[PDB]
């Protein structure tokens, strides 16, 4: 069904992503888009709406141009960096160079990283604007603007409109909504040209857990929550790079096998990493939104937010980790005080209400350690020259004493 | 000199033993020398700063040239003189049998200052053209004792005949037999005579080639040493003995020649902080290691000379000391006995159960640590309830987990 005008560049990189036949939003948008038309694309993630503006942004871009050609506007540094990061594998055969720009990182890192010339900005509205004040961000050679989950972006108002006000005149204009209220038509008369609405028809094998903690607290909670559930594979997400590697390290100090993945790490790392994770040569990827999508494996139990997607996108997309292939899935997200609403919102959107967990005590951490040992001993005994050593042991120390040693040395990590 | 004062002064030479002071106000004289010492008393730099000192680096053309006996001791002898010459830059290439000719004729392009060579690796290179002495005014005979031993006196010879007649000759020998009194009488001109008159376990395993490895693992099984260094004799043997040990579960890593310089200090930093528990190493770190805390040396090959054995296991007991012998290494064996007058224990090779019960021992001995040292009462109620569900066959199932 990617049997459209596409290039081989764009076509082997998108390959390497499993991209075979196209979906509705993909095969009605994508022509329109290629033939430089403005789209208003209805639909919620995941039915690739993602990669039915990629494509376009990626095969308009001439790489010799060392200028910005294109700008994606999101809600949120989450979905800054999802976005970004499928672009830059949809644009990574061609050499497209994607940035994501967004809010809460040193803007200083950000200069820096514009010096390299990148293609496609993907960003946050004030973060944007902030740039563009600043003179780092030029946008007078783009010539393809999406404004992404934009009924998330209904103040974003003011800022998106300051940024079309620095954006050629002439220019293709793409929109997508799961929703269209009307603040999203506003937005359509106003700054695009003869729209064509794409409109796609709106799992419950992941379970969705939320938890109300302090920030202090999240990172004994997260471990108790290791010791009660002991996961396959897991996945911990985070909202920075540091708190990603500094997560990993705490992880790894206290005996996890654990390993963090982010957006400053070379491509050679992240691979490296995702390979000892998809192996399980580490229990516990700990990540940014960098990891959120199309991972290619397939036995991830568990995800936990440590910190809160803010918008429902990022959200499904991180917890879609797992659940994979019919079976059972557990989510976890942890939530302060202060974030309550974020909260409700990805409820009211998702549809889904997320059941509240109460954080678990360190006895109770203790004791499901204790559970899981106690089992696993069972069973081995139950399924399968080690005698005689437990003989000579037993002829010396009592069997409680002997039993109660070993426990503590099998519930160690 | 001051580039070689710093050198060994940042090397830890402070004080000159009794061989270094007595020949190398000699050396420096331009005199021949004739070095009775054995190892251990510094004769190797007794004789390595003179060349050092002597080599101009503006020349490209080979300045000195040492011969030894075993491609070991070429190792361990150029790796001594690089360092006395890190400074000043001299640059030493080593030259022996059993490697490649072709990548020695390759180095030989890069115009060493110093050779240290087997005498019928060397000569190959005279015959060949590869080797250019005509401006060697230096030639050391070290390990002269065991060269005669080996049968290298025809080789010794006519090496000598390719060397300018106006040179200076050094040698150094641990006995003077009338072989080598005679070299001596014949090659060397005025030769000044110098004459210089431990709490490590030595063991010996009698194993098979093929079977070697096995034996390696298994004595780490039992003993399972802190840290460990296990010689190897090529930088082939080094890196599949690393390869073949981390696939079994062992945290090693190898170490020789040609390597980077990032690659050989991270093995050194994982290996002095014990990220590794084994060096895998040709004799390239037999001396000037500077790495503490080695438990264990195994010579998975047996070293051919009895110097270069003796800094391998020296770098342990600062211990335990292994050296594999195939049976017709036998003999080699014993007269490293004769030459260190210090006979070796005969271990018995352990068997595939010896080293399973030495895990268990092992094992064991953690868990019994723990029964004395820790308060279990948290445990006591879930070891009762477990106890119901024999004593024996509990503890059975615990010792199956505790041994992975």
Known sequence: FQELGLSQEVMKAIERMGFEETTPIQAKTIPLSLQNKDVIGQAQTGTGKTAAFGIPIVEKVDVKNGAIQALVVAPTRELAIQVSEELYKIGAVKRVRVLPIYGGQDIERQIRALKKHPHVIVGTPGRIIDHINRGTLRLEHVHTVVLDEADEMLGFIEDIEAILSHVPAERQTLLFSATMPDPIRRIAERFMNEPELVKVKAVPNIQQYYLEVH???????????????????????????????????????????????????????????????????????????????????????????????????????????????????????????????????????????????????????????????????????????????????????????????????????
């Open 215 to 413: 920030e202090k607290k999240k990172f004994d909670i997260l471990t108790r929550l290791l010791d009660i559930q002991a996961p396959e594979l897991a996945i911990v997400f985070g909202r920075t790079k540091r708190r990603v590697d500094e997560l990993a390290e705490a992880l790894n100090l206290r005996g996890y096998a654990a390993e963090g993945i982010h957006g400053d790490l070379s491509q050679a790392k992240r691979l490296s990493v995702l390979r000892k994770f998809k192996e399980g040569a580490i229990e516990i990827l700990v990540a940014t939104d960098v990891a959120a999508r199309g991972l290619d494996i397939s036995g991830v139990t568990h995800v936990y937010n440590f910190d809160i997607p803010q918008d429902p996108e990022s959200y499904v997309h991180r917890i879609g980790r797992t659940g994979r292939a019919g079976k059972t899935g557990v989510a976890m997200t942890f939530v302060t005080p202060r974030e309550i609403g974020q909260l409700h919102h990805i409820e009211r959107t998702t549809k889904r209400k997320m059941e509240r967990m109460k954080p678990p005590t360190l006895d109770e951490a203790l004791e499901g350690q204790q559970r899981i040992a106690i089992e696993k001993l069972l069973n081995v005994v139950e399924t399968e020259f080690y005698k005689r050593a437990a003989e000579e042991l037993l002829e010396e120390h009592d069997s409680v004493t002997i039993v109660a040693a070993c426990l503590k040395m099998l519930e160690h990590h």
